[PDB]
Chains A and B, each alone.
Chain A
Amino acid sequence: FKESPLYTIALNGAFFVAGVAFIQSPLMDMLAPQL
């Protein structure tokens, strides 16, 4: 239990890393229609 400013820092950093891996990964390509 922290609920301190480093909490939102770490949470937004985690969302960032997750989104970058989602974007950079093959899964994002699947979201692109072939046409």
Chain B
Amino acid sequence: EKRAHQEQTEKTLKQAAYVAAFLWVSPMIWHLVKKQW
């Protein structure tokens, strides 16, 4: 049963890392969106 909890917390941490990468990408994407209009 503890393996499921380990998997869940591991998933949470991987998700946080992905969000941080998205934030690093985000200024360029925001400016390209502003560039479109």
Q: Are A and B in contact, CB atoms below 8 Å, in the complex?
A: no
Residues of A whose CB lies within 8 Å of any CB of B are: none
